[PDB]
């Protein structure tokens, strides 16, 4: 009757299942046919209810603390890993469901938790498995995995940044985004990309190097949410902001932006009630207005100067800085008029 | 400019 008996049972249960799978793997010996060494199936060990209950508990701060004392993150991650590796990208509903519940618990356990983020990223096999799930037929599973990667890419340490890059999570998520149908999924995928696009220049270059990614991201700037939400424009515009430092020095990529009416839409964003949107737009305009006569002229002609002037005295530091910087670029480069 | 971020969160659908 130990106080955390339920939690201990759940964690021991998924751990024992991983042992069972390891035992199967290691029993592949001559004469060990499928009848002597059957491949374990998670239904045989009540795994989906186990992770379901673990997911529910992980929403509570106190339960998370107990879960962390019992090594819950590692246990849940190893479970997710073994099922992904054993059964691959299956459409089996039981497998999809347990992978979703496990990833939800991992998202909860990584929220604001320095140690857990670093631990999960250090589990390379698990990280590779997470990234592979982005190609699942299940967009709901994609959504969950992107949620995990989102948390791992916030305040990532040096090892974690390197790992996230080495498992190819940036290109995987960008390619995933091009294929998503559901808003819920896109939201989570873009949130993760938003954080990852900030890690280093190489990550920005990887996003830009995905065929169709830039046009797609400019597309998100005018997304029409079926819910009453601005999340897609915020995160899409956020990625564009981060990546625009590289685009600024790339003529071909500027041209893709022009083809998709990027500057004009960014100006419309300056009128947004969302500070995040205005702020992202200011940053993007700052980069795009830099050292480019063509886009400078375009912005003048669109009346960007008076719009930016309206923002320089903003209480919001990013907005005030970005607007002033972009305005400076335009003011220093007045067309013949 | 400084890069911006989405931050992190508890799971939401």
Author numbering:
A (entry chain A): 400 to 736
B (entry chain G): 496 to 508
Give verbatim excerpts from the published study on this entry.
Adenomatous polyposis coli (APC) is an important human tumor suppressor protein which plays critical roles in diverse cellular processes such as Wnt/β-catenin signaling, cell adhesion, cell migration, mitosis and chromosomal instability, and so on. The N-terminal armadillo repeat (ARM) domain of APC is the most conserved region among its vertebrate and invertebrate homologs, and mediates its association with a variety of binding partners including APC membrane recruitment 1 (Amer1, also named as WTX for ‘Wilms tumor gene on the X chromosome’), Asef, Sam68, and IQGAP1. By recruiting APC to the plasma membrane, Amer1 regulates the APC-dependent maintenance of intercellular junctions. In addition, together with APC and Axin, Amer1 promotes ubiquitination and degradation of β-catenin, thus negatively regulates the Wnt signal transduction pathway.
